[PDB]
């Protein structure tokens, strides 16, 4: 439903859980991982996780949560990694280059550690517009 988010940090997908929780998964688990990249024009997308209806929104520890509110944190700047891979700068900390990246053990590990070079942050939108 609408979009899928893959990570070439080995071979995982991003995962949204109803209880405001974001993590990763080694399976095509688009039972839960459904999303919508709802641009505020200038790359910064409001990722409305269609499944739950929750906005994919980074905290100041780089922990993504399932938000009820579209804000400066959910504004996920499509910073396509020069390479094919496309990954999301959390607007607020653009200068600290706070990116979206998956920890190996199916986890949402961002804060001040997710940045370019790392396969950790190698994301590939596999979007699925069945709506």
From Swiss-Prot:
The keyword Nucleus applies. A motif (Nuclear localization signal) lies at residues 1-3. Changing residue 109 to R: No effect on LRRC59-binding. It is found in: Secreted; Cytoplasm; Cytoplasm, Cell cortex; Cytoplasm, Cytosol. Residues 103-119 are annotated as: Heparin-binding. Heparin binds at residue 9. Predominantly expressed in kidney and brain. Detected at much lower levels in heart and skeletal muscle. The gene is FGF1. In the nucleus, phosphorylated by PKC/PRKCD. Belongs to the heparin-binding growth factors family. GO terms for cellular component: cell cortex; cytoplasm; cytosol; extracellular matrix; extracellular region; extracellular space; nucleoplasm; nucleus. Monomer. Homodimer. Interacts with FGFR1, FGFR2, FGFR3 and FGFR4. Affinity between fibroblast growth factors (FGFs) and their receptors is increased by heparan sulfate glycosaminoglycans that function as coreceptors. Found in a complex with FGFBP1, FGF1 and FGF2. Interacts with FGFBP1. Part of a Cu(2+)-dependent multiprotein aggregate containing FGF1, S100A13 and SYT1. Interacts with SYT1. Interacts with S100A13. Interacts with LRRC59. Interacts with CSNKA, CSNKB and FIBP. While binding with LRRC59, CSNKA and FIBP seem mutually exclusive, CSNKB and FIBP may cooperatively interact with FGF1. One of its GO terms (molecular function) is fibroblast growth factor receptor binding. The keyword Cytoplasm applies. Plays an important role in the regulation of cell survival, cell division, angiogenesis, cell differentiation and cell migration. Functions as a potent mitogen in vitro. Acts as a ligand for FGFR1 and integrins. Binds to FGFR1 in the presence of heparin leading to FGFR1 dimerization and activation via sequential autophosphorylation on tyrosine residues which act as docking sites for interacting proteins, leading to the activation of several signaling cascades. Binds to integrin ITGAV:ITGB3. Keywords: Acetylation, Angiogenesis, Cytoplasm, Developmental protein, Differentiation, Growth factor, Heparin-binding, Mitogen, Nucleus, Phosphoprotein, Secreted. This is Fibroblast growth factor 1. It comes from Homo sapiens (Human). GO terms for biological process: activation of protein kinase B activity; anatomical structure morphogenesis; angiogenesis; branch elongation involved in ureteric bud branching; cellular response to heat; epithelial cell proliferation; fibroblast growth factor receptor signaling pathway; lung development. The chain holds residues 25 to 155 of 155 of the full protein. It comes from the Eukaryota. Changing residue 85 to A: No effect on integrin- and heparin-binding, loss of FGFR1-binding, defective in inducing FGF1 signaling, cell proliferation and cell migration.
